[PDB]
Amino acid sequence: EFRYRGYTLEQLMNMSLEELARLFPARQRRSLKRGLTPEQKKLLRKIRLAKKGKYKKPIRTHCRDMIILPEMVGLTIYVHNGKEFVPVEIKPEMIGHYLGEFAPTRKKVEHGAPG
Amino acid sequence: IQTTGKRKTAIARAVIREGKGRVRINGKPVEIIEPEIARFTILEPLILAGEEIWNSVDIDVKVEGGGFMGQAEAARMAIARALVEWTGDMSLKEKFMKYDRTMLVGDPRRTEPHKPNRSTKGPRAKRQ
Amino acid sequence: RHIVRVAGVDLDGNKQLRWALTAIKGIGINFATMVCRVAGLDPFMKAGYLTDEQVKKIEEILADPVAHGIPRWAVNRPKDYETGRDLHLITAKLDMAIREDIMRLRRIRAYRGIRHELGLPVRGQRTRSNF
Amino acid sequence: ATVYDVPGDLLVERVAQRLKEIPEIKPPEWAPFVKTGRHKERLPEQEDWWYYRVASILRRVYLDGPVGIERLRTYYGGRKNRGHAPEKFYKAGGSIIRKALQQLEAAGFVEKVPGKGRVITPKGRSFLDKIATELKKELEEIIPELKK
Amino acid sequence: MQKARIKIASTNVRSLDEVANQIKQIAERTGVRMSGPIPLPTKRIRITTRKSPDGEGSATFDRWELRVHKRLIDIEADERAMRQIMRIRVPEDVTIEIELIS
Amino acid sequence: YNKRKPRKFGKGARRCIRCGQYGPIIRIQGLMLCRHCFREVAPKLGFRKY
RNA sequence: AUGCCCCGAAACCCCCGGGCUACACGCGCGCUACAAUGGGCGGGACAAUGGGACCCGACCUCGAAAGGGGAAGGGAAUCCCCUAAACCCGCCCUCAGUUCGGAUCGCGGGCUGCAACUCGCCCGCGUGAAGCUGGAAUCCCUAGUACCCGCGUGUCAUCAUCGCGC
RNA sequence: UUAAUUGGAUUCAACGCCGGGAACCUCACCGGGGGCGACGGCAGGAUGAAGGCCAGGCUGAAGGUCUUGCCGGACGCGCCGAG
């Protein structure tokens, strides 16, 4: 089973947003207390309609700063890395983290012959 | 009698009157000042003045600005000026002059302004 | 006692107890000082006179620091990820905790996990010349 | 003789050992588990470190008169090492001296002048000058020159 | 008794001296106690800027300055005396601020 | 859509009065001048060298 | 500013994101040290320059701190930043990559911005290494100067180990 | 190396320099999106908007785009000269 601060994903489901954020670190909890962006709120409307089935579009996003909550778990969202929308599928273990962490934007650098 | 002493930035105002011998720095007794080297600088002039002049007059000196060495030097300056004015004797004047010219002249040395090319380190320091 | 074993880790008796406890990983000088104060003992005494009941007292302090008077903010992992509880980890538990955090950052495919995979600096250090 | 006529450290030690007696001064439950300042790196060594602070604080009140918390924080602050970065000065924490001062207010040695800080009551002045007179009387025998 | 306080601030020294002298000459003509002009500290605005418009070459700096002077004139309460001061011709670079302290 | 977003802070907030550059602007008591722009107007402002 | 050429749904303008930080690496200038004149607890005397109204904010209160709340007074000789560090004394540890050395990484909390994962700072705890005196070679300086010590300020909502100045 | 790490600077006189602080802005790089192009001529006009607008889909989102149909009550598509 998956546990977050001594609670499971379904246990995390029923917690209010304030109590839920109390489990988050200071950065994420304070970001939530300061209020999501209006664009973040539009994305929340999108993902919530998707989880109810009404929203059937392959869901994209630019909000790299959108902090993953337990309610995003189990959905595929495509975050803009700067050039395209890299896809990510939300496992339960990303509770307490930002979207941009899992949207790579810099490619791998390897070393060849010096000029 | 009033006297003045300037050292770098520190300024010491000294007042001398007839008294037992109590000497105070900022209202503090002379023998208790923690930096011993500064205690010796402050004690330097009246050593050569003599215990009679020491025990014939009371002195209060109040110093502001500069550091503790500068403050002690300013008090040393003001003490000598106060003594030579109170007694009005040239013998001890030449005694101090012989021991140290700055005793009654003083050091007009001042810090030069810092200049560019890594100004933080001084007027003359530069980069490598 | 020139040798004193506490919580499965040996310490020199010549060092003072606040200095002796430092040899254990998971304990710094400040942690040693506060646990010594919890014991109500002098921080400066030689560890080589540690009669065993004090060893057990320090041990059960390690087991649950919070209930012994230590606040919630002197532990190494406050609000533990799988219990919600502020716990002071030690030795193999600490290694397993950091290891699990590493594989968690890797599994989520975060940038921190990527750096731990490639053995690169995490916190934005400039590496064009450095490292 | 007043506090001015004796060294600061000896008078502070004497005031600390004397104030150990008064029950009004008691370390709070968080005192042993907090270091005296952010600038400090290692926790206080002696378990008496509380009382010397109080003995120190009252002495400042004997000299600086109306003083607030922040001025004492600047005074008790110190230099802190910033790792590879150079050191820098920082003010001391507020809670420790705040508790010490509020206990002193409870002890009645100090009073509050609102908008200006806390000052020293006549009782504290008598206590301090009594201690200073005893210390100076001793040092007069050790050092005759203080009889002057 | 009521006292009128006049602050005179100006970059130009000579204009400040002229206005102060004008007030002084008005004073004893009106026969009212007028405390002499106290010259407060002169404020020194300093700005240091790199000379080079581009970044190439040696690093050189230019230090530009303003010295703004300020004098304080306290005078006593006589409506005739304080009537004769709006009639003063004041140069542009000199600024006068007059307040009334009990 | 063509309106720049209102930036109270950052380099974008302040622009030179004279040349409008977003780079070095001196704000000592309200100049708002580009460092290049300062040198040609300092004498006009009354600045002297010493 | 401005010659010539070119660009005209762009090389014009506006919005989002990334990037400008990426690194096996070499080089430049600095920062911290490579511990005994060392490290640490307590205490004391000590400055100057400048800046201060979406500001300084004394003073009071809560919090261990980061900080939160209230808050007089200040548009400046009058209120605030404001007090220093290097210094010494009393005592503790006692030449060892170790106590120094902290890079590094985890957790929690605080702060600015609408937003710091890329890509901020600060705080408490834990880990905390390399580093134990540097060849060839070359750098600066001659008196309140060099070194050492910290501070103020420019850019600055936050960012310094930077520049200018004390 | 990178889609991109925007460019200048080469010993004395380039390398805490322009950058005198890059999360946006700075911005000049890259990817994606959106709006235009003064003023004249050709043609149109007003028969009505050129611009915004609900419900959506695309759109990261933005009546941007289109389904739908309104306003808006006023002259501006497209091509050429030229901006």
mmCIF file of N, CA, C and O in Angstrom, chain D residues 31-111:
data_model
loop_
_atom_site.group_PDB
_atom_site.id
_atom_site.type_symbol
_atom_site.label_atom_id
_atom_site.label_comp_id
_atom_site.label_asym_id
_atom_site.label_seq_id
_atom_site.Cartn_x
_atom_site.Cartn_y
_atom_site.Cartn_z
ATOM 1 N N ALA D 31 14.619 26.639 27.835
ATOM 2 C CA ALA D 31 15.928 27.284 27.926
ATOM 3 C C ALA D 31 17.085 26.341 27.624
ATOM 4 O O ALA D 31 17.923 26.686 26.773
ATOM 5 N N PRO D 32 17.202 25.161 28.245
ATOM 6 C CA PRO D 32 18.373 24.313 27.977
ATOM 7 C C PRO D 32 18.456 23.806 26.550
ATOM 8 O O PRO D 32 19.536 23.373 26.132
ATOM 9 N N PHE D 33 17.366 23.855 25.789
ATOM 10 C CA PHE D 33 17.310 23.271 24.459
ATOM 11 C C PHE D 33 17.366 24.318 23.357
ATOM 12 O O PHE D 33 17.013 24.013 22.213
ATOM 13 N N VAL D 34 17.796 25.538 23.668
ATOM 14 C CA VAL D 34 17.910 26.617 22.697
ATOM 15 C C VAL D 34 19.235 27.327 22.935
ATOM 16 O O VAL D 34 19.613 27.568 24.087
ATOM 17 N N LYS D 35 19.942 27.643 21.854
ATOM 18 C CA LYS D 35 21.186 28.388 21.975
ATOM 19 C C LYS D 35 20.904 29.886 22.063
ATOM 20 O O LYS D 35 19.899 30.391 21.557
ATOM 21 N N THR D 36 21.822 30.598 22.719
ATOM 22 C CA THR D 36 21.594 31.994 23.076
ATOM 23 C C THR D 36 21.399 32.903 21.870
ATOM 24 O O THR D 36 20.816 33.980 22.026
ATOM 25 N N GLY D 37 21.866 32.515 20.688
ATOM 26 C CA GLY D 37 21.723 33.381 19.534
ATOM 27 C C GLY D 37 21.846 32.624 18.235
ATOM 28 O O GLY D 37 22.468 31.559 18.162
ATOM 29 N N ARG D 38 21.235 33.199 17.197
ATOM 30 C CA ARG D 38 21.376 32.656 15.851
ATOM 31 C C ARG D 38 22.836 32.645 15.425
ATOM 32 O O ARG D 38 23.303 31.688 14.798
ATOM 33 N N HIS D 39 23.572 33.706 15.753
ATOM 34 C CA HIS D 39 24.979 33.775 15.387
ATOM 35 C C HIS D 39 25.799 32.674 16.039
ATOM 36 O O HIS D 39 26.786 32.223 15.450
ATOM 37 N N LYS D 40 25.426 32.234 17.234
ATOM 38 C CA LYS D 40 26.164 31.175 17.904
ATOM 39 C C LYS D 40 25.959 29.859 17.170
ATOM 40 O O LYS D 40 24.885 29.604 16.614
ATOM 41 N N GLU D 41 27.000 29.030 17.169
ATOM 42 C CA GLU D 41 27.003 27.774 16.434
ATOM 43 C C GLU D 41 26.824 26.571 17.345
ATOM 44 O O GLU D 41 26.063 25.655 17.010
ATOM 45 N N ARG D 42 27.499 26.560 18.488
ATOM 46 C CA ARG D 42 27.414 25.484 19.461
ATOM 47 C C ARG D 42 26.570 25.939 20.645
ATOM 48 O O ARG D 42 26.563 27.120 21.003
ATOM 49 N N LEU D 43 25.855 24.993 21.249
ATOM 50 C CA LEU D 43 24.951 25.339 22.333
ATOM 51 C C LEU D 43 25.738 25.846 23.544
ATOM 52 O O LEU D 43 26.936 25.578 23.667
ATOM 53 N N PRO D 44 25.093 26.598 24.441
ATOM 54 C CA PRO D 44 25.801 27.088 25.627
ATOM 55 C C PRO D 44 26.397 25.953 26.445
ATOM 56 O O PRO D 44 25.796 24.888 26.600
ATOM 57 N N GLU D 45 27.597 26.199 26.970
ATOM 58 C CA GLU D 45 28.341 25.158 27.667
ATOM 59 C C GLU D 45 27.777 24.913 29.059
ATOM 60 O O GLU D 45 27.307 23.811 29.363
ATOM 61 N N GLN D 46 27.811 25.930 29.912
ATOM 62 C CA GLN D 46 27.412 25.771 31.300
ATOM 63 C C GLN D 46 25.893 25.841 31.441
ATOM 64 O O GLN D 46 25.198 26.528 30.688
ATOM 65 N N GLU D 47 25.386 25.113 32.434
ATOM 66 C CA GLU D 47 23.969 25.141 32.770
ATOM 67 C C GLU D 47 23.578 26.397 33.538
ATOM 68 O O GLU D 47 22.383 26.640 33.735
ATOM 69 N N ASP D 48 24.551 27.200 33.957
ATOM 70 C CA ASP D 48 24.322 28.481 34.606
ATOM 71 C C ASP D 48 24.144 29.627 33.612
ATOM 72 O O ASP D 48 23.884 30.760 34.035
ATOM 73 N N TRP D 49 24.243 29.351 32.306
ATOM 74 C CA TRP D 49 24.273 30.406 31.297
ATOM 75 C C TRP D 49 23.053 31.311 31.358
ATOM 76 O O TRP D 49 23.136 32.470 30.940
ATOM 77 N N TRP D 50 21.922 30.810 31.855
ATOM 78 C CA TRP D 50 20.749 31.660 32.002
ATOM 79 C C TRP D 50 21.037 32.825 32.934
ATOM 80 O O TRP D 50 20.832 33.991 32.576
ATOM 81 N N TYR D 51 21.545 32.528 34.127
ATOM 82 C CA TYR D 51 21.599 33.541 35.172
ATOM 83 C C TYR D 51 22.566 34.655 34.802
ATOM 84 O O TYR D 51 22.260 35.840 34.982
ATOM 85 N N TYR D 52 23.728 34.295 34.244
ATOM 86 C CA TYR D 52 24.658 35.314 33.769
ATOM 87 C C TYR D 52 23.991 36.254 32.780
ATOM 88 O O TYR D 52 24.279 37.456 32.779
ATOM 89 N N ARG D 53 23.103 35.733 31.933
ATOM 90 C CA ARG D 53 22.370 36.605 31.025
ATOM 91 C C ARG D 53 21.570 37.629 31.818
ATOM 92 O O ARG D 53 21.691 38.838 31.594
ATOM 93 N N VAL D 54 20.795 37.158 32.798
ATOM 94 C CA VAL D 54 19.997 38.071 33.608
ATOM 95 C C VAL D 54 20.904 39.050 34.336
ATOM 96 O O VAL D 54 20.705 40.270 34.272
ATOM 97 N N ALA D 55 21.936 38.530 35.008
ATOM 98 C CA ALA D 55 22.926 39.391 35.639
ATOM 99 C C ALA D 55 23.511 40.377 34.645
ATOM 100 O O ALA D 55 23.742 41.541 34.986
ATOM 101 N N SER D 56 23.743 39.938 33.409
ATOM 102 C CA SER D 56 24.212 40.865 32.391
ATOM 103 C C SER D 56 23.148 41.911 32.094
ATOM 104 O O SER D 56 23.425 43.116 32.116
ATOM 105 N N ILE D 57 21.909 41.463 31.873
ATOM 106 C CA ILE D 57 20.865 42.362 31.386
ATOM 107 C C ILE D 57 20.643 43.497 32.373
ATOM 108 O O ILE D 57 20.655 44.677 32.001
ATOM 109 N N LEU D 58 20.475 43.156 33.652
ATOM 110 C CA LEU D 58 20.279 44.178 34.672
ATOM 111 C C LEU D 58 21.427 45.176 34.666
ATOM 112 O O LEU D 58 21.205 46.388 34.788
ATOM 113 N N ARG D 59 22.658 44.690 34.494
ATOM 114 C CA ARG D 59 23.796 45.599 34.451
ATOM 115 C C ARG D 59 23.630 46.611 33.329
ATOM 116 O O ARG D 59 23.863 47.811 33.524
ATOM 117 N N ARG D 60 23.183 46.153 32.159
ATOM 118 C CA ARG D 60 22.935 47.077 31.061
ATOM 119 C C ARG D 60 21.886 48.104 31.459
ATOM 120 O O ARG D 60 22.021 49.295 31.151
ATOM 121 N N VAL D 61 20.850 47.667 32.179
ATOM 122 C CA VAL D 61 19.820 48.601 32.619
ATOM 123 C C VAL D 61 20.410 49.610 33.591
ATOM 124 O O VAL D 61 19.957 50.759 33.654
ATOM 125 N N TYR D 62 21.424 49.210 34.361
ATOM 126 C CA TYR D 62 22.067 50.155 35.260
ATOM 127 C C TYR D 62 22.804 51.252 34.508
ATOM 128 O O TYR D 62 23.082 52.303 35.092
ATOM 129 N N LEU D 63 23.114 51.038 33.231
ATOM 130 C CA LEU D 63 23.946 51.947 32.456
ATOM 131 C C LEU D 63 23.197 52.596 31.304
ATOM 132 O O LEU D 63 23.274 53.816 31.129
ATOM 133 N N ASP D 64 22.473 51.813 30.510
ATOM 134 C CA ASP D 64 21.768 52.340 29.351
ATOM 135 C C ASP D 64 20.361 52.828 29.669
ATOM 136 O O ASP D 64 19.726 53.434 28.799
ATOM 137 N N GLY D 65 19.862 52.593 30.880
ATOM 138 C CA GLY D 65 18.569 53.091 31.279
ATOM 139 C C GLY D 65 17.454 52.558 30.395
ATOM 140 O O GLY D 65 17.303 51.342 30.243
ATOM 141 N N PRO D 66 16.645 53.447 29.777
ATOM 142 C CA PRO D 66 15.526 52.947 28.970
ATOM 143 C C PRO D 66 16.013 52.227 27.729
ATOM 144 O O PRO D 66 16.536 52.851 26.801
ATOM 145 N N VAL D 67 15.849 50.908 27.714
ATOM 146 C CA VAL D 67 16.336 50.057 26.637
ATOM 147 C C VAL D 67 15.236 49.076 26.265
ATOM 148 O O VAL D 67 14.564 48.520 27.141
ATOM 149 N N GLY D 68 15.049 48.872 24.963
ATOM 150 C CA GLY D 68 14.093 47.910 24.461
ATOM 151 C C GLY D 68 14.744 46.585 24.117
ATOM 152 O O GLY D 68 15.950 46.384 24.271
ATOM 153 N N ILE D 69 13.912 45.664 23.637
ATOM 154 C CA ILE D 69 14.391 44.324 23.317
ATOM 155 C C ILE D 69 15.388 44.370 22.166
ATOM 156 O O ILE D 69 16.432 43.708 22.206
ATOM 157 N N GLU D 70 15.085 45.145 21.124
ATOM 158 C CA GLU D 70 15.924 45.135 19.931
ATOM 159 C C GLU D 70 17.319 45.675 20.212
ATOM 160 O O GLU D 70 18.298 45.182 19.643
ATOM 161 N N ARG D 71 17.433 46.691 21.065
ATOM 162 C CA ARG D 71 18.749 47.233 21.372
ATOM 163 C C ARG D 71 19.610 46.199 22.087
ATOM 164 O O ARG D 71 20.802 46.055 21.787
ATOM 165 N N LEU D 72 19.020 45.446 23.015
ATOM 166 C CA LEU D 72 19.757 44.358 23.645
ATOM 167 C C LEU D 72 20.099 43.264 22.644
ATOM 168 O O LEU D 72 21.187 42.682 22.712
ATOM 169 N N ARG D 73 19.187 42.969 21.713
ATOM 170 C CA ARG D 73 19.479 41.967 20.693
ATOM 171 C C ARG D 73 20.683 42.376 19.860
ATOM 172 O O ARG D 73 21.547 41.547 19.554
ATOM 173 N N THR D 74 20.753 43.651 19.481
ATOM 174 C CA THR D 74 21.938 44.142 18.788
ATOM 175 C C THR D 74 23.164 44.024 19.676
ATOM 176 O O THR D 74 24.248 43.665 19.204
ATOM 177 N N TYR D 75 23.019 44.330 20.966
ATOM 178 C CA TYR D 75 24.169 44.242 21.855
ATOM 179 C C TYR D 75 24.661 42.810 21.997
ATOM 180 O O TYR D 75 25.854 42.538 21.821
ATOM 181 N N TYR D 76 23.767 41.881 22.320
ATOM 182 C CA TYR D 76 24.149 40.494 22.534
ATOM 183 C C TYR D 76 24.384 39.736 21.237
ATOM 184 O O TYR D 76 24.848 38.592 21.282
ATOM 185 N N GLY D 77 24.078 40.331 20.091
ATOM 186 C CA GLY D 77 24.397 39.709 18.827
ATOM 187 C C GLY D 77 25.889 39.494 18.671
ATOM 188 O O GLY D 77 26.705 39.902 19.499
ATOM 189 N N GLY D 78 26.257 38.839 17.576
ATOM 190 C CA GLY D 78 27.659 38.546 17.357
ATOM 191 C C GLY D 78 27.940 38.173 15.919
ATOM 192 O O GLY D 78 27.067 38.226 15.051
ATOM 193 N N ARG D 79 29.191 37.795 15.685
ATOM 194 C CA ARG D 79 29.650 37.435 14.354
ATOM 195 C C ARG D 79 29.389 35.956 14.096
ATOM 196 O O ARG D 79 29.622 35.115 14.968
ATOM 197 N N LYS D 80 28.904 35.647 12.894
ATOM 198 C CA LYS D 80 28.501 34.305 12.505
ATOM 199 C C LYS D 80 29.217 33.909 11.223
ATOM 200 O O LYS D 80 29.369 34.725 10.306
ATOM 201 N N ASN D 81 29.648 32.650 11.171
ATOM 202 C CA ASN D 81 30.335 32.117 10.003
ATOM 203 C C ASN D 81 29.321 31.675 8.957
ATOM 204 O O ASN D 81 28.399 30.910 9.252
ATOM 205 N N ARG D 82 29.504 32.155 7.728
ATOM 206 C CA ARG D 82 28.616 31.856 6.616
ATOM 207 C C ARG D 82 29.192 30.797 5.685
ATOM 208 O O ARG D 82 29.028 30.897 4.464
ATOM 209 N N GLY D 83 29.870 29.798 6.230
ATOM 210 C CA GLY D 83 30.481 28.766 5.409
ATOM 211 C C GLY D 83 31.617 29.337 4.589
ATOM 212 O O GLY D 83 32.450 30.076 5.110
ATOM 213 N N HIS D 84 31.649 28.995 3.300
ATOM 214 C CA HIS D 84 32.634 29.599 2.414
ATOM 215 C C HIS D 84 32.446 31.105 2.297
ATOM 216 O O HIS D 84 33.426 31.826 2.088
ATOM 217 N N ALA D 85 31.217 31.596 2.423
ATOM 218 C CA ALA D 85 30.999 33.029 2.398
ATOM 219 C C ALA D 85 31.640 33.667 3.631
ATOM 220 O O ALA D 85 31.828 33.001 4.653
ATOM 221 N N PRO D 86 31.991 34.951 3.567
ATOM 222 C CA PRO D 86 32.610 35.589 4.734
ATOM 223 C C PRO D 86 31.633 35.704 5.894
ATOM 224 O O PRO D 86 30.415 35.621 5.735
ATOM 225 N N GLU D 87 32.196 35.900 7.080
ATOM 226 C CA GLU D 87 31.385 36.046 8.278
ATOM 227 C C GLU D 87 30.567 37.332 8.222
ATOM 228 O O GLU D 87 30.832 38.231 7.419
ATOM 229 N N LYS D 88 29.551 37.415 9.083
ATOM 230 C CA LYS D 88 28.741 38.621 9.186
ATOM 231 C C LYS D 88 28.127 38.725 10.572
ATOM 232 O O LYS D 88 27.888 37.719 11.239
ATOM 233 N N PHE D 89 27.860 39.957 10.990
ATOM 234 C CA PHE D 89 27.262 40.203 12.291
ATOM 235 C C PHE D 89 25.749 40.043 12.224
ATOM 236 O O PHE D 89 25.117 40.384 11.222
ATOM 237 N N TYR D 90 25.172 39.518 13.303
ATOM 238 C CA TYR D 90 23.734 39.340 13.413
ATOM 239 C C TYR D 90 23.306 39.660 14.837
ATOM 240 O O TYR D 90 24.095 39.542 15.776
ATOM 241 N N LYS D 91 22.045 40.063 14.986
ATOM 242 C CA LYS D 91 21.495 40.347 16.301
ATOM 243 C C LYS D 91 21.165 39.049 17.034
ATOM 244 O O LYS D 91 20.998 37.987 16.429
ATOM 245 N N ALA D 92 21.058 39.150 18.354
ATOM 246 C CA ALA D 92 20.708 37.997 19.162
ATOM 247 C C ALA D 92 19.202 37.754 19.124
ATOM 248 O O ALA D 92 18.409 38.626 18.758
ATOM 249 N N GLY D 93 18.810 36.547 19.515
ATOM 250 C CA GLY D 93 17.406 36.210 19.582
ATOM 251 C C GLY D 93 16.681 37.032 20.629
ATOM 252 O O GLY D 93 17.268 37.570 21.568
ATOM 253 N N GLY D 94 15.367 37.126 20.457
ATOM 254 C CA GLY D 94 14.559 37.985 21.298
ATOM 255 C C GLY D 94 13.925 37.283 22.480
ATOM 256 O O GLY D 94 13.795 37.875 23.553
ATOM 257 N N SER D 95 13.530 36.022 22.298
ATOM 258 C CA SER D 95 12.738 35.343 23.320
ATOM 259 C C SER D 95 13.499 35.186 24.630
ATOM 260 O O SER D 95 12.905 35.332 25.704
ATOM 261 N N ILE D 96 14.796 34.883 24.571
ATOM 262 C CA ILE D 96 15.555 34.635 25.794
ATOM 263 C C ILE D 96 15.595 35.886 26.660
ATOM 264 O O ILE D 96 15.226 35.859 27.843
ATOM 265 N N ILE D 97 16.022 37.007 26.083
ATOM 266 C CA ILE D 97 16.094 38.229 26.870
ATOM 267 C C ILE D 97 14.699 38.726 27.212
ATOM 268 O O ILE D 97 14.510 39.380 28.237
ATOM 269 N N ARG D 98 13.701 38.430 26.378
ATOM 270 C CA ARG D 98 12.339 38.829 26.717
ATOM 271 C C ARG D 98 11.860 38.114 27.971
ATOM 272 O O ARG D 98 11.280 38.739 28.865
ATOM 273 N N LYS D 99 12.096 36.803 28.058
ATOM 274 C CA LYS D 99 11.722 36.069 29.262
ATOM 275 C C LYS D 99 12.526 36.546 30.460
ATOM 276 O O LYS D 99 11.982 36.692 31.562
ATOM 277 N N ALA D 100 13.823 36.794 30.268
ATOM 278 C CA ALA D 100 14.636 37.298 31.369
ATOM 279 C C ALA D 100 14.107 38.636 31.869
ATOM 280 O O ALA D 100 13.979 38.853 33.078
ATOM 281 N N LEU D 101 13.769 39.535 30.947
ATOM 282 C CA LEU D 101 13.283 40.852 31.324
ATOM 283 C C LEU D 101 11.912 40.779 31.971
ATOM 284 O O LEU D 101 11.629 41.536 32.901
ATOM 285 N N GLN D 102 11.046 39.883 31.498
ATOM 286 C CA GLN D 102 9.729 39.762 32.108
ATOM 287 C C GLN D 102 9.818 39.141 33.496
ATOM 288 O O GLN D 102 9.058 39.523 34.393
ATOM 289 N N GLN D 103 10.745 38.205 33.702
ATOM 290 C CA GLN D 103 11.000 37.716 35.052
ATOM 291 C C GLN D 103 11.545 38.827 35.939
ATOM 292 O O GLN D 103 11.162 38.942 37.109
ATOM 293 N N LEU D 104 12.444 39.653 35.399
ATOM 294 C CA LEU D 104 12.968 40.783 36.157
ATOM 295 C C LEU D 104 11.849 41.740 36.547
ATOM 296 O O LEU D 104 11.807 42.239 37.678
ATOM 297 N N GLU D 105 10.937 42.009 35.616
ATOM 298 C CA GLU D 105 9.773 42.827 35.922
ATOM 299 C C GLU D 105 8.947 42.187 37.025
ATOM 300 O O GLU D 105 8.486 42.870 37.946
ATOM 301 N N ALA D 106 8.761 40.867 36.956
ATOM 302 C CA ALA D 106 8.107 40.160 38.049
ATOM 303 C C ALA D 106 8.923 40.245 39.330
ATOM 304 O O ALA D 106 8.353 40.363 40.421
ATOM 305 N N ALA D 107 10.252 40.191 39.223
ATOM 306 C CA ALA D 107 11.115 40.330 40.388
ATOM 307 C C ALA D 107 11.102 41.739 40.967
ATOM 308 O O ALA D 107 11.565 41.929 42.097
ATOM 309 N N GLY D 108 10.594 42.724 40.229
ATOM 310 C CA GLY D 108 10.440 44.068 40.740
ATOM 311 C C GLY D 108 11.683 44.925 40.694
ATOM 312 O O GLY D 108 11.620 46.094 41.092
ATOM 313 N N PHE D 109 12.812 44.392 40.225
ATOM 314 C CA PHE D 109 14.023 45.198 40.133
ATOM 315 C C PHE D 109 13.948 46.217 39.005
ATOM 316 O O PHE D 109 14.543 47.295 39.112
ATOM 317 N N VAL D 110 13.227 45.897 37.932
ATOM 318 C CA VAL D 110 13.112 46.764 36.768
ATOM 319 C C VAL D 110 11.649 47.136 36.584
ATOM 320 O O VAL D 110 10.742 46.462 37.078
ATOM 321 N N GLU D 111 11.433 48.234 35.866
ATOM 322 C CA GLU D 111 10.096 48.686 35.512
ATOM 323 C C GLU D 111 10.079 49.007 34.027
ATOM 324 O O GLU D 111 11.122 49.055 33.376
#
